[PDB]
Amino acid sequence: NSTATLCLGHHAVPNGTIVKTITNDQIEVTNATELVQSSSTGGICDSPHQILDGENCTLIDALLGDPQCDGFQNKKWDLFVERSKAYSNCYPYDVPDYASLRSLVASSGTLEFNNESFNWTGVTQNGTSSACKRKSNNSFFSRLNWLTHLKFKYPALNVTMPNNEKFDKLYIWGVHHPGTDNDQIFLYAQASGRITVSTKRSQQTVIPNIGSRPRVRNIPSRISIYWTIVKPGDILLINSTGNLIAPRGYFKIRSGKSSIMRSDAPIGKCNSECITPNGSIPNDKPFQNVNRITYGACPRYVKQNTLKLATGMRNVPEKQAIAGFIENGWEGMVDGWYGFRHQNSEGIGQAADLKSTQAAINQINGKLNRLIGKTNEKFHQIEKEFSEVEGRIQDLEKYVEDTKIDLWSYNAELLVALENQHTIDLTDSEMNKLFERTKKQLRENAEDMGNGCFKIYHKCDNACIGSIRNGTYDHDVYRDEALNNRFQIK
Amino acid sequence: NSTATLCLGHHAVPNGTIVKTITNDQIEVTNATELVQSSSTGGICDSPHQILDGENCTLIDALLGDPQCDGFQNKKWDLFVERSKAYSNCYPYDVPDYASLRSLVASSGTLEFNNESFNWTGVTQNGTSSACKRKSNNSFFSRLNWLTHLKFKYPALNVTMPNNEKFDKLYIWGVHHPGTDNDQIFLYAQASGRITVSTKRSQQTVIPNIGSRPRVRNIPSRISIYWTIVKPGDILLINSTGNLIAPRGYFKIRSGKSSIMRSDAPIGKCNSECITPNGSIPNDKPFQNVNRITYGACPRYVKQNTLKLATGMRNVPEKQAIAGFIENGWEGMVDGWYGFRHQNSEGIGQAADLKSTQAAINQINGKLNRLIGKTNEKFHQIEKEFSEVEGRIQDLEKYVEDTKIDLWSYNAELLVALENQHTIDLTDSEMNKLFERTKKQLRENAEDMGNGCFKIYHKCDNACIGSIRNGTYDHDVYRDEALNNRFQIK
Amino acid sequence: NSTATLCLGHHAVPNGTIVKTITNDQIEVTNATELVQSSSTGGICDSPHQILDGENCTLIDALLGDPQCDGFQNKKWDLFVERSKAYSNCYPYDVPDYASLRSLVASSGTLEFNNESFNWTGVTQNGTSSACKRKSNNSFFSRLNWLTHLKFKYPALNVTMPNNEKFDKLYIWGVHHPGTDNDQIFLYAQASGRITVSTKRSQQTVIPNIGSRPRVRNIPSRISIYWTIVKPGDILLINSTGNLIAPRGYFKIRSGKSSIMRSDAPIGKCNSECITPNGSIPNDKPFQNVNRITYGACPRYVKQNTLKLATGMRNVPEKQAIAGFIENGWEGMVDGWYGFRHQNSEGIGQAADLKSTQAAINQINGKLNRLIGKTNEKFHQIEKEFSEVEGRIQDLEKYVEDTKIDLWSYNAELLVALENQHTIDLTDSEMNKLFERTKKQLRENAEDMGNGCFKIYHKCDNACIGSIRNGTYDHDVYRDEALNNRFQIK
């Protein structure tokens, strides 16, 4: 007796978690949170982005007007979703630079189409085919006009359409490649010649090529699809003597945040900002390992499947006389992160220190605020999966994406290691500061026992201990008693 | 009396600035400096890079030799500046892969042209047009030679030009697409056929296509422009029966640091290393938010419009008995960053500590030296703005640039937060070190009062205090007096 | 006498090395290690990757079956090495999009070829040329079949080959462009017409173009090479009336980690994971400045030619009474990094502290483990050197690579500065912790002399000093003696 003990300490928990810092590959802390999103619901939420499910139609089929795609006429989207099951069911066609037409329409985000009255004097309009049935009748692409001879004549077409609007017009047109010379004459009444579609700023000349291709839906012929954008004040000129699959008008072309994604995920009635081909994913976390293909406010794609951010201090078991923080945590300290234990004339007691606890918690919450719920939006990007071998351009698309992902993965690894080191440092610092504050209060009335405790060399009852904890302890009151006890001969 | 007080402290200023660190989203420091350049003069400085202002000419117009561009013949540049007002005023033309020819000429940095004597036996040379007037006379592109029939014959051309130089030759040539069959015969005396331009390593065959395009400067015909590079030891071969717009010789093609930029900024008589389309910008700062398009030694483009680097310590107001640094700065400390305040028999005094002040200043100046005036040069890059919709290739160019900017923006954000944390840490450290040095000098002659001051338990006049400040205080001299005062019963 | 001195200290070495930290551009440490690989042996090791040395053959020559490349038939590779000396020695040819065919074959990693029996009824097969000698006889590309007229007839070919396999087939074919009309008739018995090669999903039509090109190996004609990939369930259709250089079958096309590299480095009998055009390089270091072109588990390319990672503490010379660590290292401390020096009744002694030494060494070894021998593999990428001027696509390839390298170079610079600062901090910390532990043990029996030493105010013989070093010193045993000595009047 005639003395008291005051220990400074911090909490510990029975179920700590392992994180990485700059100092340690593995260090156990009291708590952590995951920064890599690794699951999806598996459905694409239909809100808040405007989703257009292609069903059996690709975007290009919906553009040309395949009859199974008639329900898509004039629709808009933020995200057009193309399904793996999609198939063409009209005249067999190809699109030189298909990927680019798909991209530009996808990014435009609209199928709005305005009919125009082209002057097709001297030919038959509206050719149809049993390969393109609409309501069980022979038909054709809705937005295209198959012109054939009239009374066994096909006079040279030289047809104009000015753009007197204040917006751009996108024209889609085609060239028919007949299977045989017999079809050429049957359809156009004369041998094939070139088609030239021009503006003041552009020209495209295409040669029809007669010949059998392998039959697709029993058709050995083909249509090749082309496009032309016409600016305000410019003029579309179409020049042909046959084989022309004419436009019926133009598509509006807009700019904004629209895109296209390949996915078989079902569309759900729900709300989620981030879309991936695997489904929508929560965007609370800064990183994700679900898919490199994303649309909307999304976490950044990284290679790691987990990155744990420390949200508490180092977790240190209790050693099995009271003792302080030196190689020792306090599992029984449940109402604070830091505090005091004492032994005096009135017993052994514990109290949490609110200031130090709140200081650590505030700083941790600060870094959570920077990292959680702070994702940025991206929209139309580049393609990142490919169904065909292409060489140079695809090599570059792949390398650009690989490069980006490795750089982000590195940033994520370093960021978490740095933040975790800072959390360990700031929580260690709050303990050290509390110890030093207490040391300073006690002046010459106590000695440091080396275990995170002070031996107070005077009687220090519950109110006295509370005065130390509260910062109102007056060392002068006890100094005579303390010095006598400290510097006595034994 | 019989004692003195010695406080350690640091300065504070009335007008501090807010910065970000790893610990704090907002912390006030005594001073900071801006690391993002956000303004431009608005003019492109004509020094130290060689500027060529295109005025009404695009580079390609200057290459072909549009008469309004005659003043550009043979000129070189570091940066060719194309103006939005530029317009063609010669025969209407297009360039398949215009962007590439523009790029390669821009990067080459020269319009040097060497005439060669091609053997055009049997045709008429130097065709002209009222669509391409030079000094009010019908004329044509200076570097091109419009060949037409001679005496209603156009014999098959098969013309050679060896490269016996030790450098590459760039040839620019064309194909004339006449508006009508009548023009074809009037000009070339026979029906159109293909043109083949070849070397030992390459071949290009082009088909003239007769037909009306929309009139441009009253001309429904077109010229399509092509290019061929011929290596030393190789041979250009030109094979044609009409429609050939022949080269008059070759352009030198060089390699170096030349580029091209679209800008309407006026050119000024001034000197600046970094050029953007908005004008030249100072390059003292490591980052800039003026334009992603740059030429020369330029700060790196980031999305942030401000990033403040701390250049002083935490700014802490004075609490309103002398007191030291514990939650308290000294606004009256104007000749140093750190120092001493004392109270003794002779009054209350202040003195700056030079060593600690210079230590902080030196470290801050060190990081300024790494960050300020250290930009790196870039020259010809990729295009970053586009006037036409193109799809795939443009999608990739845009994504590469977006990717780069987001990565640099992240680096900039982290760098400044890390540096600012280090500045706060190093300035706090200098204060702590000064306090600890002083504590060690004083030995058993003083006690820590907890407010950044020592109670010195002996008479310590001005010279004595100075001895402490100077590091020459001899604790043994005063220890008997001090111990008697410290360990007295009161 | 009646007292002892105990100093805490750390080692120093006579040959320290300069590194960079966040605090200091240059600080000398006791040791460092290089993180940038800057040399190569100069040979490409033939293990563990499967190397195929092209010798005089490009990959495309080996594909087509140039007779000097016959030894390559059906071979596979991880890395195909093309030599600058390589040359074609068969019929002169070109490949529109050569770079892409080269890339896709390179990435596929196999020349496996399966013959098929095409129905060439009505034509002569196996045309040969003195321009393509095999064992001194006129011959031709092994994988191609030069068809010519039979009995002065060349009937219209319309030939099919179904893919009934479960893998893709790559077909290589060509179009012959004869030098003259005489050759056209001599070979094909009629005027030239188009060739169409099609599948259910693709069509390619090519026009033979008659004309002299500059002679290559005395041949003014040319063959243009094309390719077609045919999926399971699809069908190749070949439609021609002449000028067809027919396939003899197909190449397997595989996917995996194969690539191609341009290098003149000799191939050696050795084992190395990382290949560059300069030769194989060790992959222990995380970065390298040898070549941006790499294959395998390679350090990342950076611009720096050296980055030194500190592997020891700050190196501080000995000041020329024992003294501790304050501005002073101990060159004579050779069995530990940290330790104790003492002066007592029995002499002056030194002992290393094992715990502190091992703590620093362990942490440094930890960071070495993260950085050394941890490279990641990359395989087929993009090309990074170019022999011809191309404009837009090449501009983008170059910019993507420059962008990547600058970002990695920045990461490397920051990483090393951060790690070195952490090493300085952790080694300084071990010294400070040892001093503080000792202070705590000594309680009221010693005073801090300010030079990293304690004055112990009692007789403290060798065993006593050892008790302090061992952590078993009992301050209570000596406290009466120590207090009497400390607080005596002199």
Ligand SMILES: *[C@@H]1O[C@H](CO)[C@@H](O[C@@H]2O[C@H](CO)[C@@H](O[C@H]3O[C@H](CO)[C@@H](O)[C@H](O)[C@@H]3O)[C@H](O)[C@H]2NC(C)=O)[C@H](O)[C@H]1NC(C)=O
């Ligand atoms: C060039 O060769 C092609 C492949 O041999 C050939 O296409 C094939 O044509 C046959 C006959 O028309 C089709 O077979 C059809 O046979 C009966 C005809 O009564 C139909 O009822 C069936 O539906 C059946 O399809 C093949 O389908 C077709 N093969 C392919 C791959 O398309 C071309 O006809 C040939 N071209 C010329 C100009 O002769």
Ligand SMILES: *[C@@H]1O[C@H](CO)[C@@H](O[C@@H]2O[C@H](CO)[C@@H](O[C@H]3O[C@H](CO)[C@@H](O)[C@H](O)[C@@H]3O)[C@H](O)[C@H]2NC(C)=O)[C@H](O)[C@H]1NC(C)=O
């Ligand atoms: C194919 O159709 C084109 C568009 O209708 C047409 O071009 C137009 O030609 C007319 C008549 O030459 C031009 O009008 C000109 O009329 C008088 C003629 O005396 C001139 O003095 C005027 O300057 C005026 O320009 C149009 O300008 C022109 N329109 C366009 C868009 O180019 C072609 O002539 C037609 N082609 C053929 C082969 O008939």
Ligand SMILES: *[C@@H]1O[C@H](CO)[C@@H](O[C@@H]2O[C@H](CO)[C@@H](O[C@H]3O[C@H](CO)[C@@H](O)[C@H](O)[C@@H]3O)[C@H](O)[C@H]2NC(C)=O)[C@H](O)[C@H]1NC(C)=O
């Ligand atoms: C179009 O012009 C070409 C270039 O003038 C020309 O090619 C040249 O043809 C000559 C004559 O055949 C070749 O010279 C050869 O002369 C004797 C003939 O007995 C040979 O023994 C020699 O080996 C020698 O090569 C040139 O080599 C050749 N030049 C080039 C660059 O290829 C074409 O023949 C011309 N085309 C037409 C259709 O006339």
Ligand SMILES: *[C@@H]1O[C@H](CO)[C@@H](O[C@@H]2O[C@H](CO)[C@@H](O)[C@H](O)[C@H]2NC(C)=O)[C@H](O)[C@H]1NC(C)=O
């Ligand atoms: C583009 O249209 C023009 C104008 O109709 C065509 O020009 C003529 O075509 C007919 C039949 O081929 C000739 O009888 C006329 O003599 C031609 N000239 C004129 C001035 O009418 C032209 O053929 C068309 N071009 C293409 C490629 O289809």
Ligand SMILES: *[C@@H]1O[C@H](CO)[C@@H](O[C@@H]2O[C@H](CO)[C@@H](O)[C@H](O)[C@H]2NC(C)=O)[C@H](O)[C@H]1NC(C)=O
């Ligand atoms: C390339 O030039 C050659 C050589 O002049 C041309 O060859 C001939 O052209 C004339 C007229 O068309 C014929 O009478 C000759 O019989 C051809 N052969 C020779 C050996 O002279 C050829 O037409 C030119 N090719 C092109 C595409 O313009």
Ligand SMILES: *[C@@H]1O[C@H](CO)[C@@H](O[C@@H]2O[C@H](CO)[C@@H](O)[C@H](O)[C@H]2NC(C)=O)[C@H](O)[C@H]1NC(C)=O
């Ligand atoms: C593709 O093959 C078909 C079928 O052999 C060719 O068609 C004919 O060719 C001959 C001679 O040119 C004509 O007499 C026939 O009347 C054509 N039709 C049919 C049904 O046999 C065709 O020419 C070939 N196409 C090409 C571009 O070579």
Ligand SMILES: [C]C(=O)[N][C]1[C]([O])[C][C@]([O+]#[C-])(C([O])=O)O[C]1[C]([O])[C]([O])[C][O]
């Ligand atoms: C447009 C036209 O012409 N169409 C026709 C129809 O109507 C019918 C038929 O039958 C056979 C189908 O449907 O298919 O046909 C057609 C045509 O003519 C053909 O197909 C072409 O090839």
Ligand SMILES: [C]C(=O)[N][C]1[C]([O])[C][C@]([O+]#[C-])(C([O])=O)O[C]1[C]([O])[C]([O])[C][O]
């Ligand atoms: C080269 C030539 O030829 N040129 C000519 C001239 O001289 C004149 C005229 O008028 C009509 C003009 O100028 O334009 O014309 C020309 C030509 O011929 C034409 O134009 C083409 O188309």
Ligand SMILES: [C]C(=O)[N][C]1[C]([O])[C][C@]([O+]#[C-])(C([O])=O)O[C]1[C]([O])[C]([O])[C][O]
């Ligand atoms: C395939 C064929 O035809 N081949 C031939 C041979 O046999 C021989 C000769 O001589 C001349 C050589 O070798 O070259 O020729 C040939 C051919 O014919 C030619 O060359 C083509 O041009």
Ligand SMILES: *[C@@H]1O[C@H](CO)[C@@H](O)[C@H](O)[C@H]1NC(C)=O
């Ligand atoms: C762990 O940390 C997270 C983030 O602050 C928090 O939401 C969660 O409540 C914490 N868990 C516990 C058991 O304290």
Ligand SMILES: *[C@@H]1O[C@H](CO)[C@@H](O)[C@H](O)[C@H]1NC(C)=O
């Ligand atoms: C799509 O096509 C499939 C297969 O023919 C058909 O069964 C299904 O009903 C179609 N779905 C829609 C939405 O039209």
Ligand SMILES: *[C@@H]1O[C@H](CO)[C@@H](O)[C@H](O)[C@H]1NC(C)=O
């Ligand atoms: C349509 O074109 C014809 C033929 O060129 C022309 O004569 C006529 O003016 C046009 N018809 C109408 C209704 O404008």
Ligand SMILES: *[C@@H]1O[C@H](CO)[C@@H](O)[C@H](O)[C@H]1NC(C)=O
């Ligand atoms: C998402 O889909 C991709 C692509 O098919 C697949 O590789 C990945 O494992 C999926 N991830 C999840 C979480 O479903």
Ligand SMILES: *[C@@H]1O[C@H](CO)[C@@H](O)[C@H](O)[C@H]1NC(C)=O
């Ligand atoms: C603030 O910092 C900058 C950079 O060191 C310096 O140039 C400027 O003089 C400082 N301002 C003041 C008021 O000290």
Ligand SMILES: *[C@@H]1O[C@H](CO)[C@@H](O)[C@H](O)[C@H]1NC(C)=O
């Ligand atoms: C460029 O063209 C404009 C418009 O015709 C003309 O007024 C101006 O003088 C021209 N400028 C130069 C530098 O030739």
Ligand SMILES: *[C@@H]1O[C@H](CO)[C@@H](O)[C@H](O)[C@H]1NC(C)=O
């Ligand atoms: C020009 O070409 C002609 C026709 O091919 C040829 O005969 C003659 O040698 C050439 N003229 C000169 C001056 O070399």
